[PDB]
């Protein structure tokens, strides 16, 4: 085990759900949902009839409400709950005003949903992908079709739906059993062209990076990670999307290994989150390994197994500067860079002054003034 003073990261437990009386029977992907580090929503059932909303921003205060619905998520930052029943009926409520933001019935059941932005909720059915601007005031409007699902997502469990800030690029992630392992399939979608591309991958996120020469204008990159179910080889890719011709500097595509030890045969990437501010990628595996990469270069900075209990969900942490996850024991664990230790770590453990400068300059971090 590595001591905290030696790490490039700060590692914390936000809450333990079992400590709060949550049964392990509900500590699973469909029951215990996590859109951001602000809230955890636990669906419980007893005698044929609830949600426990854990407010991580208010000392882990628990709000319990009975519900007729069978699935629920909280918004990333506001006291706004989205509930669905029988896959077709969806309602979204501001719990503070008790006001209904959205209320509609879909023609095809929702099988997956995820907040794409502060304004927009993403929905996936067996055949389609839709989005709703939940705050637009049009309570009874159904979500607008984004596109049909690609055939590559056929017979998958949909596990993520992400978008860029512009809400014109999207990725939907599904997994399936193959070769005794879990393979990942991603449908990438450009709304501008209304065209999809199918790729292999278990995790996906869109982010932005400020490059020298481009002034204050960021370029957009898509970050994706895969473990090949046939070979067992892991790979992270970072690629530019929609390069603005007015900008002189381009982002060169980066590809880096995702290491898996010989005894982690059936592990795979389960989450990826990125700090735009620091240019740091956080990749988490199902078996609890954290992998940090520098965003500009794709360089691997750090690998450590932060938990031995399997992870089932994750989300952004600390104003999207880190990653948080939930393990099978209901531990909500958080990793972010250590602002005081990361630069010294790169200088001393990685022995790389140039990389240390990249990180320190982008993040405004101490350690490389000399």
């Amino acid at each position: 085990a590595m001591a905290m003073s030696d790490l490039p990261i700060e590692f914390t437990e936000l809450v333990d759900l079992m400590s709060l009386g949550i049964s392990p029977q509900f500590l699973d992907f469909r029951s215990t949902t996590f859109e951001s580090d602000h809230f955890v929503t636990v669906r419980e059932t007893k005698d044929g009839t609830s949600v426990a909303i854990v407010d991580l921003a208010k000392g882990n205060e628990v709000t319990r409400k009975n519900m007729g619905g069978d699935s629920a998520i909280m918004h990333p930052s506001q006291m706004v709950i989205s509930v669905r029943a029988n896959g077709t009926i969806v309602q979204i409520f501001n719990l503070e005003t008790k006001s209904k933001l959205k209320s509609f019935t879909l023609d095809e059941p929702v099988i997956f949903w995820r907040w794409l932005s502060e304004t927009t909720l993403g929905f996936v059915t067996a055949r389609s992908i839709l989005t709703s601007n939940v705050f637009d005031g049009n309570v009874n409007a159904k979500p607008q079709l984004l596109t049909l699902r690609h055939a590559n997502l056929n017979n998958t469990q949909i596990i993520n739906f992400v978008a860029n800030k512009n809400l014109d690029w999207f990725a939907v992630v599904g997994i399936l059993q193959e070769n005794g392992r879990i393979a990942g399939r991603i449908q990438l979608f450009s709304k501008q062209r209304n065209i999809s591309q199918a790729i292999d991958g278990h995790v996906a996120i869109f982010t932005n990076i400020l490059l020298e020469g481009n002034g204050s204008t960021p370029v957009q990159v898509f970050v994706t990670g895969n473990r090949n179910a046939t070979t067992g080889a892991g790979e992270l890719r970072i690629i530019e999307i929609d390069h603005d011709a007015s900008l002189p500097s381009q982002y060169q595509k980066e590809t880096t290994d995702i290491f898996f030890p010989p005894d982690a045969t059936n592990d795979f990437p389960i989450a990826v989150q990125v700090s735009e501010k620091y240019g740091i990628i956080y990749l988490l595996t199902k078996y609890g390994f954290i992998h940090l990469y520098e965003l500009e270069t794709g360089t691997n900075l750090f690998v450590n197994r932060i938990t031995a209990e399997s992870v089932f969900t994750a989300a952004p942490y600390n104003h999207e500067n880190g990653i948080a996850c939930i393990n099978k024991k209901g531990q909500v664990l958080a990793v972010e860079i250590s602002t005081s230790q990361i630069v010294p770590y790169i200088l001393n453990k990685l022995s790389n002054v140039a990389l240390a400068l990249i990180v320190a300059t982008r993040g405004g971090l101490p350690g490389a003034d000399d």
């Binding site: 699973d28 469909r30 469990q157 997994i175 879990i182 389960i270 199902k286 089932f312 099978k328």
Partner: peptide, 7 residues
Amino acid sequence: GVSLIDL
């Protein structure tokens, strides 16, 4: 069906 991600 059982959730794959929870296996």
